[PDB]
């Protein structure tokens, strides 16, 4: 596939500008200059500020979804899958500060295009966990989906607490605590 | 009267959403004049915050009462999860206003101060004889509250595909035994 290196450079700068300034104050002139290109060159890659914003959101969502699916699809047992998938989520939120704000701390949810890019994403990650959990479980499929929702919720909320509290314990202790809790439940917390 | 107005305002806010909801519609559905509504609430925002506060208090009081029990840890988990699913069924409007709300720092704080108080309680129970670093104990309490809420929201949003009792037991069993006990 032909690599549009100028597109990727633009998405990187646009991610920072949108997060740092907010959607309203962010401008195409600011984004072009940050990338070191003229505004007409920016328009040869993106049609509008909204199409660029949606491409930025899509890039961060794709990175999260692909990271999670790669964890689920490149492991052979339940426990291993849990370890690698929890790790992948902590890695995403720690390593993609822009992606984290755009997906999880987003105010600009007033328009359907943005809200859809997040709601289709969350459901796809839950679908994947559900596919793995339901297989040879003997569970009613709705109970299996309920568990997948709970498992994703428990993992996301633990990770978000850790990041939002400015990493009060090491990343390793947070990952270990989250995995141990997801695997053994409250019965094995002590 | 105030309580009667909070009940009608809750229905108007749910039916129309915050932005489309109007003080004239709220006064009309309560069978009072608009000036009478204003003798109890200063603005649509003050009324909305009072509505959210009432529903949050009902939920929080139900959850803390469940956590007050001097039984075992799993029994307390069971009574608290039951109390949350019960809140969704007996106060459906409250559940929608707190958890399925499209609509600002005043609103977010009324939900955040609530969530933090319930997490404080779960943390107090979890930290007692676990030997955990307090931040790890709080992290687990956050996860436990989060998964319970998310399981219950799935069940409601999917139009109760299984009975409330089966949903409570499934949520409790997952919270207690974790993924290690899901096939069993
Ligand atoms: C919004 C994206 C959330 C990503 C959450 C990733 C971690 C959840 C744990 C997944 C475990 C898969 C199930 C299994 O191991 O059987
Ligand atoms: C934000 C709404 C709060 C919903 C509360 C759901 C139940 C939480 C689980 C409580 C578990 C108690 C643990 C224990 O006894 O060790």
Author numbering:
A (entry chain A): 35 to 224
B (entry chain B): 40 to 142, 145 to 225
What did the study's authors say about this model?
We had previously identified the transcription factor FasR, as a key activator of fas and acpS gene expression. fas and acpS, respectively, coding for FAS I synthase and 4-phosphopantetheinyl transferase (essential to produce functional ACP), form a single operon in Mtb. FasR:DNA binding is regulated by long-chain acyl-CoAs, which are themselves products of FAS I, namely acyl-CoAs ≥ C16 disrupt the interaction of Mtb FasR with its cognate DNA6. FasR is a TFR member that senses long and very long acyl-CoA moieties, subsequently turning off FAS I-mediated fatty acid biosynthesis. We have now determined the 3D structures of FasR from Mtb, in three different states obtained with the protein (i) crystallised alone, (ii) co-crystallised in complex with the fatty acid C20-acyl-CoA and (iii) in complex with a double-stranded DNA oligonucleotide bearing the specific FasR-binding sequence.
